[PDB]
Short mmCIF file of C-alpha atoms in Angstrom, two decimals:
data_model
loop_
_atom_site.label_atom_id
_atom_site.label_comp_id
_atom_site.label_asym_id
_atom_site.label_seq_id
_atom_site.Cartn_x
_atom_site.Cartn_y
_atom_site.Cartn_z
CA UNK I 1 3.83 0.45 24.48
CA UNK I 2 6.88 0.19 25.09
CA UNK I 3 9.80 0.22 23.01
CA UNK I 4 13.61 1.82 23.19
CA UNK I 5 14.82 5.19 22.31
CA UNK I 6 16.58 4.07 19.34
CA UNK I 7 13.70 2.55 17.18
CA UNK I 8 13.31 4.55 14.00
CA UNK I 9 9.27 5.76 13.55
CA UNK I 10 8.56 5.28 10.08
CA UNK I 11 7.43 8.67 8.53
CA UNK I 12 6.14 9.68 4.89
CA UNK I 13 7.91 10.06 1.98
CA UNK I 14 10.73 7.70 2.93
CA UNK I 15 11.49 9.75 6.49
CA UNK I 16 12.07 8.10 9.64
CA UNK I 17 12.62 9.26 13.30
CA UNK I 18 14.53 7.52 15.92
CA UNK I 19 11.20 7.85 18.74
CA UNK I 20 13.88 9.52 21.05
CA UNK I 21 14.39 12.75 18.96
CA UNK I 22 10.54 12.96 18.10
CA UNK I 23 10.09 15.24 21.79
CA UNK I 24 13.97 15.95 21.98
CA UNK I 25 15.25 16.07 25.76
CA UNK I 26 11.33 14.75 26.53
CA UNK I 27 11.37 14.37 30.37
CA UNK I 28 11.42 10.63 32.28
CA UNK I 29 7.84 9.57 32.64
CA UNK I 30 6.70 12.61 30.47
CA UNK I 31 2.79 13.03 28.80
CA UNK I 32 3.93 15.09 26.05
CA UNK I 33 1.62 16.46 22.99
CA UNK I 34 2.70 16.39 19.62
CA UNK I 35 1.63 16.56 15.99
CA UNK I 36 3.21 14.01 13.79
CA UNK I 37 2.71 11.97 10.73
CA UNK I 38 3.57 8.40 10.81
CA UNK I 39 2.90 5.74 9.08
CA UNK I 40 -0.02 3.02 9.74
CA UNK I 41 -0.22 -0.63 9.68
CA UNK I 42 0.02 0.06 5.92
CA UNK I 43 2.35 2.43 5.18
CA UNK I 44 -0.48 5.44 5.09
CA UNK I 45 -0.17 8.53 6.98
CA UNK I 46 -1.57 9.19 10.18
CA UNK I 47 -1.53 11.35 12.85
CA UNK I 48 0.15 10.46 16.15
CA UNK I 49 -0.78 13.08 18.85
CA UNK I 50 1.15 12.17 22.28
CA UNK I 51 4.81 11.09 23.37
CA UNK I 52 4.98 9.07 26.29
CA UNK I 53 8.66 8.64 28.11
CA UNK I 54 7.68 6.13 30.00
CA UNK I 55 10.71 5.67 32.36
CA UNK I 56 12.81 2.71 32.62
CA UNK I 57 12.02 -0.82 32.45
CA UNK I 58 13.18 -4.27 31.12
CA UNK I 59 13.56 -4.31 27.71
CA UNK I 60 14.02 -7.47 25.32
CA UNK I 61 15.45 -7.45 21.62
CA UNK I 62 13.28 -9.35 18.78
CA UNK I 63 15.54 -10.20 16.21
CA UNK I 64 14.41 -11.38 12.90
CA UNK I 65 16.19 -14.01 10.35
CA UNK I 66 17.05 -11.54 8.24
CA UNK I 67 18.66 -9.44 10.66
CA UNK I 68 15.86 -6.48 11.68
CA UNK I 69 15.48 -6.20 15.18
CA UNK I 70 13.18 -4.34 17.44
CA UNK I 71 13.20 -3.83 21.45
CA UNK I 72 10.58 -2.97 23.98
CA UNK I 73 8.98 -4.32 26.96
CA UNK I 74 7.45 -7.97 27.85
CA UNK I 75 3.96 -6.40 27.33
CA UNK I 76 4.83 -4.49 24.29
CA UNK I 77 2.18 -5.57 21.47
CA UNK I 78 4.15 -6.13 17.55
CA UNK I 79 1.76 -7.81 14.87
CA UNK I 80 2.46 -11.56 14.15
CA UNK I 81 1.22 -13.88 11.61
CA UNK I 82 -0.58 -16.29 13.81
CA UNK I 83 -2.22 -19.68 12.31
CA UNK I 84 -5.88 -19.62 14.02
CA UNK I 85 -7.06 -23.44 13.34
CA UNK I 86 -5.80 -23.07 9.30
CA UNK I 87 -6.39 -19.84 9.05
CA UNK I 88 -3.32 -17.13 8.39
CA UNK I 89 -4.26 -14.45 10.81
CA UNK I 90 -2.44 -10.60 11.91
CA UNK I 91 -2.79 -10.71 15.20
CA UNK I 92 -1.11 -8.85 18.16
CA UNK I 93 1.67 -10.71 20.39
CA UNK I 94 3.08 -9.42 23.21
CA UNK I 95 6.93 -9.70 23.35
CA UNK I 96 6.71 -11.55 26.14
CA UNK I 97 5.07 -14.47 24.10
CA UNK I 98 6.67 -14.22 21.04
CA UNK I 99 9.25 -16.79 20.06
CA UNK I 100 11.27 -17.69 17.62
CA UNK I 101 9.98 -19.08 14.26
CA UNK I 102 6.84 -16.70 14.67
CA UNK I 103 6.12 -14.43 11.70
CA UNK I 104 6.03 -10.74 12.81
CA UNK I 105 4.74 -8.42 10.31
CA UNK I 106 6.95 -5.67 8.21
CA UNK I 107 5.51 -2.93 6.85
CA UNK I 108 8.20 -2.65 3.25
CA UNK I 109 7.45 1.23 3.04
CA UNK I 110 9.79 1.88 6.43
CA UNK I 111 12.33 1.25 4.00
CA UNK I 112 13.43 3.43 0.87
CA UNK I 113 11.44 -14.13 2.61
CA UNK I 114 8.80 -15.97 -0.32
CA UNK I 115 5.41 -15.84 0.31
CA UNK I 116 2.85 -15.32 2.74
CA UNK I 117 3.51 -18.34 4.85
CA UNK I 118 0.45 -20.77 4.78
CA UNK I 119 -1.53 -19.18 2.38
CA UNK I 120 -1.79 -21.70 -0.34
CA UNK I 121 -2.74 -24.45 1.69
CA UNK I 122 -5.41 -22.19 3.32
CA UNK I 123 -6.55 -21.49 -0.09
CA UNK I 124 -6.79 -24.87 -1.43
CA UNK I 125 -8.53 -25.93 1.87
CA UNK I 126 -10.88 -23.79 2.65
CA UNK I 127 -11.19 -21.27 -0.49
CA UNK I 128 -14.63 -21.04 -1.17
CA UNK I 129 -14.75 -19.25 2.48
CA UNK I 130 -17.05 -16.65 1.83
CA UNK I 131 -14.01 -14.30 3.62
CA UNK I 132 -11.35 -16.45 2.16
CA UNK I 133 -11.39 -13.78 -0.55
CA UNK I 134 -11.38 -10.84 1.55
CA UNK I 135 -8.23 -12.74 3.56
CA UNK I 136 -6.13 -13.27 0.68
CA UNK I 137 -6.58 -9.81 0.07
CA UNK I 138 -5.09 -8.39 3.72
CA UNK I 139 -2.00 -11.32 3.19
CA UNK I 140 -0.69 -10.52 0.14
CA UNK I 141 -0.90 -6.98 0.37
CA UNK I 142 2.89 -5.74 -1.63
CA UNK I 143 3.42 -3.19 1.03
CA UNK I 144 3.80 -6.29 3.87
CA UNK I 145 6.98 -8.64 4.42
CA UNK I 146 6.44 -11.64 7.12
CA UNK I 147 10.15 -12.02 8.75
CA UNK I 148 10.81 -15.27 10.90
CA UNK I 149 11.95 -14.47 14.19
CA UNK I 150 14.62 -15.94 15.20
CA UNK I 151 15.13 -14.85 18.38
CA UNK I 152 14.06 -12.88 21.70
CA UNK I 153 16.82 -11.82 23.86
CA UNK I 154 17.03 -9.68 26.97
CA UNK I 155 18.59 -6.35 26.71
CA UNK I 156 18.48 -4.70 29.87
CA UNK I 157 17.01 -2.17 31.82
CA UNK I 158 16.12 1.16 29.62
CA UNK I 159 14.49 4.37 29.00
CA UNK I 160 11.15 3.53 26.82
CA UNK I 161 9.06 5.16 24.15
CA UNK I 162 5.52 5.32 23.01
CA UNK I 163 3.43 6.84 20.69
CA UNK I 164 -0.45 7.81 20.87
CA UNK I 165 -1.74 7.68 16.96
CA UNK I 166 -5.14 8.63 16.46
CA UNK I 167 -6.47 5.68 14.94
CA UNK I 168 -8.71 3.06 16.04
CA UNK I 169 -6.00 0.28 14.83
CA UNK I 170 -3.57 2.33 16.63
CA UNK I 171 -0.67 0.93 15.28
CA UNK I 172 2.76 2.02 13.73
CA UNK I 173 5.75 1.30 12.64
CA UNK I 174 8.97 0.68 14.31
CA UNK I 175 12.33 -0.26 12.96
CA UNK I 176 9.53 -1.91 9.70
CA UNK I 177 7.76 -3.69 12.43
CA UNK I 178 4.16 -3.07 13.19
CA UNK I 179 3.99 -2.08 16.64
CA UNK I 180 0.71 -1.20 18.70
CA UNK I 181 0.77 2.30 20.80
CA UNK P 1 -12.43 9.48 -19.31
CA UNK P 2 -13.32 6.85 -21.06
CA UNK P 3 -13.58 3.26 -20.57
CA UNK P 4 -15.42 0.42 -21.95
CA UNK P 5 -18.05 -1.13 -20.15
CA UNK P 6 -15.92 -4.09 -19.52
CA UNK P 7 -13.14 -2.53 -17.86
CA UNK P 8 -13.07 -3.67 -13.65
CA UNK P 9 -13.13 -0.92 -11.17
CA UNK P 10 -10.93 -2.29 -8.01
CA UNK P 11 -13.03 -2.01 -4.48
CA UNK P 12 -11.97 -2.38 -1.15
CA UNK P 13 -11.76 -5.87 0.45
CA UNK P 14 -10.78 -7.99 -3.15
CA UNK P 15 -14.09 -7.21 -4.53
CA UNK P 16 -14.80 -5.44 -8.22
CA UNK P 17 -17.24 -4.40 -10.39
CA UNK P 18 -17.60 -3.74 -14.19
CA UNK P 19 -17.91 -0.74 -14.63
CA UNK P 20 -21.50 -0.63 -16.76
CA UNK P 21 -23.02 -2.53 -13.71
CA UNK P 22 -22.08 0.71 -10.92
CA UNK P 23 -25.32 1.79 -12.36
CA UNK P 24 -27.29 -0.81 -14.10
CA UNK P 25 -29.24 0.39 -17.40
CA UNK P 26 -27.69 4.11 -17.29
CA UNK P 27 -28.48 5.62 -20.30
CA UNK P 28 -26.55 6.75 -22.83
CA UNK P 29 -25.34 10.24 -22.04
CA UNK P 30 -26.21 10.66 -18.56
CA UNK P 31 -25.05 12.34 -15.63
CA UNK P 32 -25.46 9.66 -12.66
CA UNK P 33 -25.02 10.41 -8.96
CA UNK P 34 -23.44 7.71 -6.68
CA UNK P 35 -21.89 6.77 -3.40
CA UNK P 36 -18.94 4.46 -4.50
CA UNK P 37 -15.62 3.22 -2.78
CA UNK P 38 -12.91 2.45 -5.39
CA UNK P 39 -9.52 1.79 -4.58
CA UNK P 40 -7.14 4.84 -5.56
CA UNK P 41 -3.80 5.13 -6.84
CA UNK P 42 -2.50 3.54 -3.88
CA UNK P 43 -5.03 1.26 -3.62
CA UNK P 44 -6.50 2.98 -0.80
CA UNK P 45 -10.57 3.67 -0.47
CA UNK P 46 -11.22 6.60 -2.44
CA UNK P 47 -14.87 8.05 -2.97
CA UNK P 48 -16.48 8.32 -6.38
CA UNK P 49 -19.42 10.14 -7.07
CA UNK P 50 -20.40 10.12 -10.15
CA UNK P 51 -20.66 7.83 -12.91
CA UNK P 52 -20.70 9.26 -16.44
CA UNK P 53 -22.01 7.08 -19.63
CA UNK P 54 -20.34 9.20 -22.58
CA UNK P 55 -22.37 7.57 -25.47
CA UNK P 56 -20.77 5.29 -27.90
CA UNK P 57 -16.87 6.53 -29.01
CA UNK P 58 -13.89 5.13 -30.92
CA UNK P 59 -12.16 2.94 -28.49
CA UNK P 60 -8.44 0.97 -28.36
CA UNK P 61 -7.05 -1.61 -26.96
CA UNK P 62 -3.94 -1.41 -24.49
CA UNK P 63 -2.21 -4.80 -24.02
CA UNK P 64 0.60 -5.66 -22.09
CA UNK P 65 3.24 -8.25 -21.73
CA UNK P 66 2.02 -10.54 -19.34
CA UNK P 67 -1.85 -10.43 -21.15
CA UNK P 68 -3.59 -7.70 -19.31
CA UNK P 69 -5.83 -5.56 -21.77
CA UNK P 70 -7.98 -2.15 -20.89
CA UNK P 71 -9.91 -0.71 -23.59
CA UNK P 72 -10.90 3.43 -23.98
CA UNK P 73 -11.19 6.49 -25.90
CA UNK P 74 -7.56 8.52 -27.44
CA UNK P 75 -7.73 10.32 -24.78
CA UNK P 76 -8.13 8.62 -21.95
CA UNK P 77 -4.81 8.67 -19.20
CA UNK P 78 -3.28 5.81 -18.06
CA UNK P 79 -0.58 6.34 -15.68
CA UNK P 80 2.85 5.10 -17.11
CA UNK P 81 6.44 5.12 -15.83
CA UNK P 82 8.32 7.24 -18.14
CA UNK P 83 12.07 8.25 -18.31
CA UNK P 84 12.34 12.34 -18.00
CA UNK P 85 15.50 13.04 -18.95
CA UNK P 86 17.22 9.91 -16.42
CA UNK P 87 14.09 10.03 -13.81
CA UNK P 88 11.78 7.40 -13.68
CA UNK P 89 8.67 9.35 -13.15
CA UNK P 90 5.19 8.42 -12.94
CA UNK P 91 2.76 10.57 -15.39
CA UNK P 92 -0.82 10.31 -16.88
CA UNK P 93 -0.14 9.69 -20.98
CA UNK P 94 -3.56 9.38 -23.21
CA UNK P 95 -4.14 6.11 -24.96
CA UNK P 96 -3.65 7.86 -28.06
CA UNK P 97 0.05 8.36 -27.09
CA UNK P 98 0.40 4.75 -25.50
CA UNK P 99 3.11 2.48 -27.77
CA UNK P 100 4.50 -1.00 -27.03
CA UNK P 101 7.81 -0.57 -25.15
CA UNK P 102 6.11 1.92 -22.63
CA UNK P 103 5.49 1.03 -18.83
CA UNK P 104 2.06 1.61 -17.39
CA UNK P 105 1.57 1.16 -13.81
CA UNK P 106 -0.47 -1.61 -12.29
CA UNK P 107 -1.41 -1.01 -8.76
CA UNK P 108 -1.72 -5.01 -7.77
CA UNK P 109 -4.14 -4.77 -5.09
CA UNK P 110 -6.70 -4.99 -8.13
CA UNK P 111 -6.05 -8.36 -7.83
CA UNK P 112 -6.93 -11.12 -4.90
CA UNK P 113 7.93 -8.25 -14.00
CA UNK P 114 11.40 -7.30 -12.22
CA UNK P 115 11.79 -4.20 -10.73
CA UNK P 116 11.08 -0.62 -11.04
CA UNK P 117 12.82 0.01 -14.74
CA UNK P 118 15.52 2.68 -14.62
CA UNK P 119 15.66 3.57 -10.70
CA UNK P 120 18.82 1.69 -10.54
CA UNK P 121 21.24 3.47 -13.23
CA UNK P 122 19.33 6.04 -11.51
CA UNK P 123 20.16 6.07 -8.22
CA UNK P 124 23.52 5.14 -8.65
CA UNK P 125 24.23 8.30 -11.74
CA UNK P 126 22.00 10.59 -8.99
CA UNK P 127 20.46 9.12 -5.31
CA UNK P 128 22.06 12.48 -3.90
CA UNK P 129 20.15 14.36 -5.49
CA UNK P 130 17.68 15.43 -2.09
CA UNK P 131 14.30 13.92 -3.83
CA UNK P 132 16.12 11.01 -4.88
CA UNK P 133 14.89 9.37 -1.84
CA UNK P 134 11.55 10.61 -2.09
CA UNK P 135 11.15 9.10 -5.68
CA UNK P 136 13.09 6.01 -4.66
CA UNK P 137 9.72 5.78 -2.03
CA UNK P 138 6.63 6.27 -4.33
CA UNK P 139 8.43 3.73 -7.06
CA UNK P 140 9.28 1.43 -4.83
CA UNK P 141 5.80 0.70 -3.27
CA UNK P 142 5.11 -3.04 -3.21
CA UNK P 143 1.70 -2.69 -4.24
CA UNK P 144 3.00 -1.32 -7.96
CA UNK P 145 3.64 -2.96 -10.89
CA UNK P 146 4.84 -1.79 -14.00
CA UNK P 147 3.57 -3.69 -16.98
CA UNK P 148 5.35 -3.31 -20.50
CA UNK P 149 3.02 -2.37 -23.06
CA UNK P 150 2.50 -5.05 -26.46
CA UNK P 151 0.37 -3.58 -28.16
CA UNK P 152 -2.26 -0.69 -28.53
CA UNK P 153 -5.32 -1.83 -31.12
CA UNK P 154 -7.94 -0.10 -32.37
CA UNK P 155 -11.04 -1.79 -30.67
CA UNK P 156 -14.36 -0.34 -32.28
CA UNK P 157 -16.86 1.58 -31.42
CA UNK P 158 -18.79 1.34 -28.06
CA UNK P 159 -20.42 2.49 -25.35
CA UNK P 160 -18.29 4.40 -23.27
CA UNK P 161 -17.61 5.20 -19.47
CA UNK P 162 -15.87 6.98 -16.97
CA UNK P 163 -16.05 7.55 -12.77
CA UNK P 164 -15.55 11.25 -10.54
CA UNK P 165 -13.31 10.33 -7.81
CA UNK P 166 -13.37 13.39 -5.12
CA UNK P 167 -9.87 13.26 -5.17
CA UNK P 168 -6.84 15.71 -6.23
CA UNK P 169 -5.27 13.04 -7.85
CA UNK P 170 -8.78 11.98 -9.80
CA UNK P 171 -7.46 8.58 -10.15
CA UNK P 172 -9.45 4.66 -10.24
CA UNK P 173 -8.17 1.13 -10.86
CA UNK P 174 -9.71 -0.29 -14.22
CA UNK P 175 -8.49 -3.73 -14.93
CA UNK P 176 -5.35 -3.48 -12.61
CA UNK P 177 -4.32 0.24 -14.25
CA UNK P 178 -4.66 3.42 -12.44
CA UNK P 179 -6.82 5.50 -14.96
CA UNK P 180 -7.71 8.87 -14.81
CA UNK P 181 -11.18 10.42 -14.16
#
């Protein structure tokens, strides 16, 4: 939590929702139940069961090499490809730390450069990991896409959105980023 | 149904399993009750709950392009993209029917050329067409694969086997192919 009015929610079947319109006219600092599909952390349906307006803070934009761009607030949680000691980890960032030349995650489905950056030297280094198996799995998922950001600017004061999905994860996606509720 | 004993059923996590090994010495003919995740379609967890040994049956060969191979009865269904009448769609055909030139689908997630043939001409001849975007989605997924069928041989006789997924779809990864139940 918290990101801008204008981020599209991905939804099944190639839908998407700007998080604005999902309670349209939702009041300023607003609990407000819904029932909605949206996509997970990979591009599965699940159910997201409250809107949160939460009023109007500071908002800064993450902007990615390729262009895709996402904006919420300094403690606003989007999934990064961290390197953990040699080891390619998802792991949650806060906008507030993220920086440019940091690898968030894109979930491909929320739309209808090469490779999972330092996999192969993980691989040929460690391997015979018991887990380094189960890793490579998670990485090279098709469905994911690991942008370079390039960078995090601020963009004001604004109204900001959140979404409560009913998963332990409790993550979706936002303008192909993987944001946390 | 069927499948060779050979033929690797996709689990969560990377991991597989030959099919004649979900239960070890079944006998011939037998109606087995198990507690199995398999990867589905999608590659998603899918429960299986039985696993059927059909006896011994004429078997084939399916071989693709790039090498892989899955062997079973005439009438087992593989899921292939075929063209219906200027839509790529995705539909179960029965080995018996399988011929080089045809596209099954690999779901790469069983694992741990360029692009989806036809939705170009496609899109660009329909994409308004309201479900254009819908198929657009499902074809697009990055965890497919569509392989181009070499070569269908006849294989033998042998023992033969098959899973029950408790799903609508009845669908299992064998050797990187979606099969059917």
């Amino acid at each position: 939590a918290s990101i801008t009015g204008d981020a599209l929610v991905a939804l099944p079947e190639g839908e998407s929702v700007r998080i604005a319109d999902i309670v349209p006219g939702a009041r300023p600092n607003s609990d407000n139940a819904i029932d909605l599909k949206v996509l997970d952390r990979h591009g599965n349906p699940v159910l997201a069961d409250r809107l949160f307006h939460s009023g109007e803070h500071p908002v800064y934009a993450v902007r990615t090499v390729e262009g895709l761009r996402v904006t919420g607030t300094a403690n606003h949680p989007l999934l990064c490809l961290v390197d953990v000691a040699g080891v390619p980890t998802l792991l949650w960032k806060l906008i507030d730390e993220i920086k440019p030349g940091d690898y968030a995650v894109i979930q491909r489905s929320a739309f209808s450069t090469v490779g999972v950056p330092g996999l192969v030297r993980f691989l040929e280094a460690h391997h015979r990991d018991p887990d380094a198996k189960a890793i490579a799995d998670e990485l090279t998922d098709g469905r994911f896409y690991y942008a370079k950001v390039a960078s995090v600017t601020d963009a004001g004061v604004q109204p900001v959105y959140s979404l409560r999905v009913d998963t332990a994860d409790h993550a979706f996606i936002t303008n192909g980023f993987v944001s946390h509720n």
